[PDB]
């Protein structure tokens, strides 16, 4: 039984400024990787001995995703403003957490995809991995949208695949 | 490698 979690965090500032993006990786509760937008050279970097053995393309590829998640978060903060009818001056924080629970037999036991706006529950992928739980009427919109477009399935792609796979690839360096 | 961009909210 092992775990893996990623916590992404964006925080909007005021006026002409892109949010502050933050992502940290956890291998069974221990931080092994971290990204931050503030750093003069914003890049993914290892937080644990073993992890420093991966090649430059891996960091260049994993850093590239970050660039995309920033574009996503930037756009999705705006969206959330409308949902809750909030002044465009206020600063807010959107956080994402995803990952997978592998069994003793290295299989897949549970999956995770969930969000939180300014600390409150927004939407979360249920256990059956095909339905969602929405916290408020605003999240109920995201849900309906994700119900029609097949959000679960989309994510269930990465989960059942790369996620489980790459987890094991990390459990070999320990 | 990790997940792809989530579907918009």
């Amino acid at each position: 039984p092992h775990s893996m979690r990623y916590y992404e965090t964006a925080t909007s500032r005021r006026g002409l400024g892109e949010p502050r993006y933050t992502s940290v990786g956890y291998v069974d509760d221990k931080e092994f990787v971290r990204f931050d937008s503030d750093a003069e050279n914003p890049r993914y970097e290892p937080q644990v001995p073993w992890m420093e053995q991966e090649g430059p393309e891996y960091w260049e590829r994993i850093t590239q995703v970050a660039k995309g998640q920033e574009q996503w978060f930037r756009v999705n903060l705006r969206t959330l403003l409308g949902y809750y009818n909030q002044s465009a001056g206020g600063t807010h924080t959107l956080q994402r957490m995803y990952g997978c629970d592998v069994g003793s037999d290295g299989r897949l036991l549970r999956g995770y995809e969930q969000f939180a706006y300014d600390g409150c529950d927004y939407i979360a992928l249920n256990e059956d991995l095909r339905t969602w739980t929405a916290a408020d009427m605003a999240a109920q919109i995201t849900r309906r949208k994700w119900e029609q477009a097949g959000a679960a399935e989309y994510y269930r792609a990465y989960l059942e695949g790369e996620c489980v796979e790459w987890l094991h690839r990390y459990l070999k360096n320990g | 490698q990790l997940s792809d961009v989530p579907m918009d909210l």
Partner: T-cell receptor
Amino acid sequence: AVTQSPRNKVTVTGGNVTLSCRQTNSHNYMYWYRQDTGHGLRLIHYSYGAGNLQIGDVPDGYKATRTTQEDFFLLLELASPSQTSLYFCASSDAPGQLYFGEGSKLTVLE
Amino acid sequence: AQSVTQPDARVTVSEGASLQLRCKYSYSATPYLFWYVQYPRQGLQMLLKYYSGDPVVQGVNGFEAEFSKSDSSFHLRKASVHWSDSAVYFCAVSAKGTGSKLSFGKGAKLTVSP
């Protein structure tokens, strides 16, 4: 619901044309495509959210502006006869899932 | 990098008869697969979509598409074609990290013979 205009326009080499597209939906992604028998649909420009622009596969001779969330404009400043085509506008809030407009037939005469 | 191939631009079948429209694409470890249909003087409409899971995507109107890991294909099939099904069918794909940039096939004009 994706509406674009003008549905039909004729112009001459050198003219200036603007194709408008408005979306009742609240989608972030908007696209401009051209359809030519023998090439199917080829992406010209697209946009993720208001005030965003990203070159497409065949952006030559075109310009685009995402003025607002619901508006996306295609701009032909120097019409070439080769630009004669059926143009399409699309929106999306999910990966690979596009809603299309009825299209704009543009003939660029010599 | 990403490529979509539809073999025949012209395909005719007798009403009631079976139908298969073929589609092969460049390999992606995880690919996002779609079919679009375009009736006369309209735009494209999404017909089917695949992301993951059961590789057979079933459409409510008798259409179905199958994802083939090995073939790297996404062929469209219908047991019995109605006359309304006359239209242009497009196969499109997008890869992880660009799942919002579709690659389209040249399409196929389906003529349902009377």
